[PDB]
Amino acid sequence: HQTHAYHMVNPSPWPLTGALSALLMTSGLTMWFHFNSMTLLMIGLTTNMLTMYQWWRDVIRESTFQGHHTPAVQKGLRYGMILFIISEVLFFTGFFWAFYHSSLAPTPELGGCWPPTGIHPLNPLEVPLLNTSVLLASGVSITWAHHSLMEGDRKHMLQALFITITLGVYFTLLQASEYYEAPFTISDGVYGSTFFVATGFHGLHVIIGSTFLIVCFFRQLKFHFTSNHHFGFEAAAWYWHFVDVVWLFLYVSIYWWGS
């Protein structure tokens, strides 16, 4: 029997199924890019979702249902989430470097100018500005949800969190429409490359963060959170503010300054 406060985790298959899912997704992408087949990739995506589902399910079982998240355990999870977000910031930093490298020194092939000849950027005062207001608003509403939770107010937590998720979904549909309507593509030189890969990874993180908020919404419906203990919500709110801040950098850099 232990007399420290930390969590000895039961032996688990999910590290291995996750590692194999990574093999299947990467060899799947290889098969898709080179051997005209999606089979391995669909298997890998499926086992990856199953792995995430059961792993985080088990974390909920360990904490809400079994009590293993003492304050010391929670403190470690706070550090882990902050470090994870730091690594994602550096990942985006590489795409911002690529954007500034190409746009500050536009080569002769581009016309020696930025934006390149033949590129007609979106108007940053139209849908991109609307998107900015949507994610900024969702930062306000998730803050309302957090205070409601701390104050023990179930109904207003749910309402504010629903609003936050709805705005996330609105951003995602607006961006999907903008992608379809854009007159330039990912194959339109370095302008299309930087634009779509940087906003596209951001878009994926908006989807990830919205999924996390939705997990939190159903956990709240099921009363898992207490007014003092709700780290999944805290982590999803941190991740959501990260996604909002990456957007503001994208808007200022690519949409506005880069227009």
Binding site: W14, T17, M31, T47, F65, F223
Partner: protein, 58 residues
């Protein structure tokens, strides 16, 4: 909805020796077998695909 966390706490704290990933009952076992079967089967398939791609095909 009603708060049924106490019931789930009883279930997952039951002294039955089961690891947490199976402690929900028989459905956990099924989802586990499906996951592991897809992973292990998929991994064999990927080795097959390596073998295939390792040689030219005219």
């Amino acid at each position: 909805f009603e708060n049924r966390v106490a019931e789930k706490q009883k279930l997952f704290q039951e002294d039955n020796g089961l690891p947490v990933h199976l402690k929900g009952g028989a459905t956990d076992n099924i989802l586990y077998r499906v996951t592991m079967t897809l992973c292990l089967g998929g991994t064999l398939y990927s080795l097959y695909c390596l073998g295939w791609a390792s040689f030219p095909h005219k």
